[PDB]
Amino acid sequence: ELSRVDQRHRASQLRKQKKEAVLAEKRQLGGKDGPPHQVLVVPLHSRISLPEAMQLLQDGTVHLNELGNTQNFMLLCPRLKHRWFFTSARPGDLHVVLDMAKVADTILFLLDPLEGWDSTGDYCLSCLFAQGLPTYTLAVQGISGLPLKKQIDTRKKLSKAVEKRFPHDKLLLLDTQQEAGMLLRQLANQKQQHLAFRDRRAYLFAHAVDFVPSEENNLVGTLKISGYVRGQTLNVNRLLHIVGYGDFQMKQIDAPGDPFPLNPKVLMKADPGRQESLQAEVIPDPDEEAEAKMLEKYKQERLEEMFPDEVDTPRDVAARIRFQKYRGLKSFRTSPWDPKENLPQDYARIFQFQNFTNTRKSIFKEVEEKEVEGAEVGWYVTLHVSEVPVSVVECFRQGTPLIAFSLLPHEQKMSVLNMVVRRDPGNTEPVKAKEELIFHCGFRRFRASPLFSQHTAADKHKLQRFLTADMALVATVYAPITFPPASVLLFKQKSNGMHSLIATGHLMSVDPDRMVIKRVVLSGHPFKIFTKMAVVRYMFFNREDVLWFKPVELRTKWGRRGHIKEPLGTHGHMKCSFDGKLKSQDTVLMNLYKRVFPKWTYDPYVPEPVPWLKS
RNA sequence: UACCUGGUUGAUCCUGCCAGUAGCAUAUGCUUGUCUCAAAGAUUAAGCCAUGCAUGUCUAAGUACGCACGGCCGGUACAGUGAAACUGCGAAUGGCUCAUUAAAUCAGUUAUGGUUCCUUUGGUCGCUCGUACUUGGAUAACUGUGGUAAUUCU
RNA sequence: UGGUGACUCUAGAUAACCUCGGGCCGAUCGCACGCCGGCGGCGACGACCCAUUCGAACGUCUGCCCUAUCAACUUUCGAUGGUAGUCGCCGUGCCUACCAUGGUGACCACGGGUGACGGGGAAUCAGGGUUCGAUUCCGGAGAGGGAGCCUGAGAAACGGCUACCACAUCCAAGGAAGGCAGCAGGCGCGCAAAUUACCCACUCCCGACCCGGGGAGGUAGUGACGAAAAAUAACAAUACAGGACUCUUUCGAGGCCCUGUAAUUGGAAUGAGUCCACUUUAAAUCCUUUAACGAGGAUCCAUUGGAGGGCAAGUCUGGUGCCAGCAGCCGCGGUAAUUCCAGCUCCAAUAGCGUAUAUUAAAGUUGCUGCAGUUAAAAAGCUCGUAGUUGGAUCUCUCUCGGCCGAAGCGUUUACUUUGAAAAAAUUAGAGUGUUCAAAGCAGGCCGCCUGGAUACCGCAGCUAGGAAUAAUGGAAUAGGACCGCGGUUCUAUUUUGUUGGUUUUCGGAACUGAGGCCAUGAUUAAGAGGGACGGCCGGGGGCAUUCGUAUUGCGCCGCUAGAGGUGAAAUUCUUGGACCGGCGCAAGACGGACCAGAGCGAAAGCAUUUGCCAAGAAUGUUUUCAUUAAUCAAGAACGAAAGUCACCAUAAACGAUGCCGACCGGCGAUGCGGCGGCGUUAUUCCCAUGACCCGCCGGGCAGCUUCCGGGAAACCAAAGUCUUUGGGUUCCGGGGGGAGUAUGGUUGCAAAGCUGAAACUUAAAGGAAUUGACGGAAGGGCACCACC
């Protein structure tokens, strides 16, 4: 500004701008216009009495809501001028913890002073990291019931204990109501974390759920649920999705009075049929037995670790018959494969994009930057939905949370979703490439069977039969389309619903065009050896199948590549030219490849799990 | 400990910089057993501030009619200890920060014979030629009636 | 009366005044009790004034970073000063009234910037320096921004008040309250920084006070900012186809001494820990002291960076194949990678070690010490010329008193030098002292004593006293000079007349004027510094006038006849409307060949026919004159090739690619000018006198040759020397290559242009001398019937 007064003036203008921005970010929450501050509470150990946490945290004015088992409630205090909403959950109840941690804004962990955290606490913590965290806070309990010499150092011991998991996070004390007030002041004034999945999409909670039946004998009626809008500006036309119970249309919004505002019934919008979202997922015109199975799985993965894709030679059936749909590639990287070569009936039921990042950035700029005049954020709205069963209301009366989010355009349809995942080092049990896994893919809950393929950059990808202990594998399956970014979780049912955390990753670009190709490798021992040429037995046992396998390539384990010349024996006895020299201990191998596709096994039901234990 | 070394050419000698070298300060990375001392929201934002605390004070010796407690011994003005309140003093020191400020601030040197100064210390305090063996009206604390959604309001 | 260096001071004397918003001159309280109804002893609280203490406030002198792309500012509306006031605690344009027109500035005013609070201090350091100082001591300022106040000894106070501006809280909507740049704490901001802990026990502060209070302060917590100490093993016995030592020719022999990459054997010693107790402390913790436990792969496990060079340490092994990557720089990597990715081994520092950025040394690459400018970056076109800077020799202590010394003067005035006193502590240097050593601390040491708690440094400016070389400055040249006595004019000290009254002089002191005596009466020399005269010369120096010469162009005439021109070649152009040619005559603008020189002159551009006029000038000669007048030069000015423009323009390989002035340092022969001598030739018939030659000498000049003077990177240079053995005076100017002499601003010019003049960004070289080769359609030589004749 080239003057000492104008430089100070310019710096004060910039400080005024930046302060306006920061105050506009910190105005959205817990005040006179914003939604309540939602604090999920989890004790990470068994010894931690959560009633002792709630009876300390209660004082403000307690507006005690209640469910069938939990004591979740709204705490209100205009001394701090802040309106909270305290919710509680049990460590291991996955269908509650991971399903309302995705709507809460603060997670309050509790930790005993002696042990860091329980094994079940480590389990739910390892789920919650991969699920996506809001701003969390740590607290202890047993420093007050401890001699004062030990309170000097138990703080230090737990600080070095949790540094593996939370590397820079102070601990607090929750023992007195002054300490609880200091904790609430910590929660109220703290810089937030913005989960972009929750930030770019509109989502809600339900505080007052009412069910009215259209037909009681149909067991499908109308829910009158009530909650504060926490995402974007709500629209009645977009699709609604209760998270564990599929998606269906929503018909009517109205704005009643707030139950408990910080300072002490009209209809807004309806939906004509042209404005409403279409309900078309697909194109309309298209004891010792299981123990022996897991031992066979053990011997299979121990077979598939020193051998890539070895299989026994089919002697009863000709090799051109059992491998009718294969081919031998010169190179997986260079020799291509046509996408319009093999197409099943499932591809005539899925939708596709002319360009994916174009429609992604346009729906980003059309929902984020643009202002629609629907139901605004922070409003205590009451939701009239079109059709909904009664079992959701029964599980509401039990104590399960009910959240819902507004779908975007091109988010109810069908495509082939992609996600790069990795293996959890907690459960080391292997898993085949075609089994069924529980999906937690961007607020959703279903089950399907993907294809576990490798993580490379080429269009062609080699299928893997199992999972790797360190390397990042990719799954590929038909699923309802949901735009990136979204954290994904894949579980398996160990026993009675005790879900096994095995696959923790994120979602990659959904496209049905990334091709996965399954190889098959056959074996045979060479037993007549000459210079740069040999004759192998046990490779095949017919003769014309080799004439069907003329242009395929051959290789040995020691890099000796080659191809056949002429099968001189009526069995698999070939003249085999090679670019190098063959050894008697070596074994020649070919690779025959085919492109695979997953199967249609999406079911929206997930079993309500038993709480997980350390067996 | 008054010090140089690599790099222009086919090879040479130069000019000349670039890079290396050592300390010192702020940050940051990885690592960390013992013990002594020890800096620490200056740099950007002399930006904004929940809550608590940071300044009060009585001796034999200004004013005690609070039974607040005891207590003479009981006509016995006031035994005593004493909250409150009036009075007096302190709150202009300390603590923090470095925005402003360029003969300004500040440093050394001089001066007030050109000023003011609570306190301390010493001097002075029948030096004046003109009801007193004691003067007058109030007001707090206290008692009692209240107002205001709300204040260390009244 | 008393004092000061100095009063319009202090004290005294007189005449009054003495503010109702009044000045002091005691209507106050405790303790011990009393002596002969009176007279009382200690205190406490007061109180005008004076002094003191703690200050404060206004002044004095010297001192500060960058900027001229800030050169004039200040003065209307106080700027500088005078007079009288007003206001103030007082001095003052502090304010008012009336006057004066001042005050500051290239010795940098005014304006702007500062990632500026100032010092004490800090880091680095041969010496000199450079950078930092928000930060615990001192001084200032400010409590969101400005402003105004009350109370008070003291505040323009903010943990006081009143507004406005900006924010912001409670509300029943009427109103009410606010100020963390105190301690914590939060948000924000960011690369960047700790506990909403305990206590008045220590140090001190405040209060009516031995008693109360203190986020001042102390104590813990977090704390790899940083500084000090210091573990991660020691030893013995075995064994080594170790090593060295004594004998053996050698083998090989030794309690001879050391070593190990021996998970060889062995018990010995300990802290880290765990943990009673004491001690510590306000209470605790920590440390120190002690129980008991606590080590063999003593797994009670040391890390961070490297291994081509710089630079200590592997062209070992596998993977990779100009990819991935490494590499501050040079570089490594393209299928054998000493450099990537790993293993193994090795190196350095070690409870620490990498990286980024600021900064210092290295940097004699900012140069005062101490650099550079021919060719590497660079010296102005030339002369004049203000400030600034620098400047030749020369000159060997006394007067009245107070006790033979001091008080009274200094001696022209400074700089310089040495001394003294005055200069906060801390920090730094440094003395003493076994914190168990050390960084520290200021304590400690003997058997109540004994002893510390030093000292130095503290630039510059200002005080004091000695010195008197160096360097400035003064004093007598119209004598208004000194030292003397004598004289005259005016005023005056107060001693003088037993006292008083008055006159009067003297004495003594000033201020002014006349004559006389006296002094060796008084001017340093005349620079191988500089001006200026004079003398005879000299020159393409300049201006004006004048004179000649050929050539060219055009014209007049005559003769001749078809070509004339230009190139490697034509091309272009004029001719029987007789071109070109040859001869004769006329005019016009010019221009001055050869003679013309490694000659001359001029400040530089530059200057050539004869003659005359005008005004200059160098050198030489001088026993002339003045007597430091000088050198270099910002600012400022005069002339300035050639191109360009309506007189301007002021620019060049403007080139010796080379500031100016001064001294010293080798030879040799020519030349130009002037002067001095000398055999002998010529000319003026002799004779001198001169001219032309010849042999020298002297002085400046233009040049050249030469050289182990000494330089220099060398080419080269008698200056480009007298340079690490570095200082004669002074000007301009350079700081790796580009961007770029570009953009913008200012300024001059009609304009072209002139002067001034960056940054972003890019880059590891660009560049100079010299040496070996390579080349040709450059020029010279030698040679071969696998060349020619």
Add this chain to the structure above:
RNA sequence: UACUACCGAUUGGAUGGUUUAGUGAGGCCCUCGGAUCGGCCCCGCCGGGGUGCCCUGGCGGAGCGCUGAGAAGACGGUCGAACUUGACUAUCUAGAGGAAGUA
């Protein structure tokens, strides 16, 4: 295929700094003002004392009596934050268009 930065109209809007002109919160000073509160008088009802009179003693009443104290408020002056309109200047932001280089 995209960036970069300029002009940039909008005299966008907003904010800051110098000044012209106009306005002027609040305190302080001055000239007034006088809501209220006292005292001294003048009587009435009247004791004691001295002697119908005076001093005390209690009231009560009124008098524009005559004085003391005195708040709100207002004229003026001063200091003076701030406000408005200009002019100049600076910055932050919304902004069409484009160009060149950047690769």
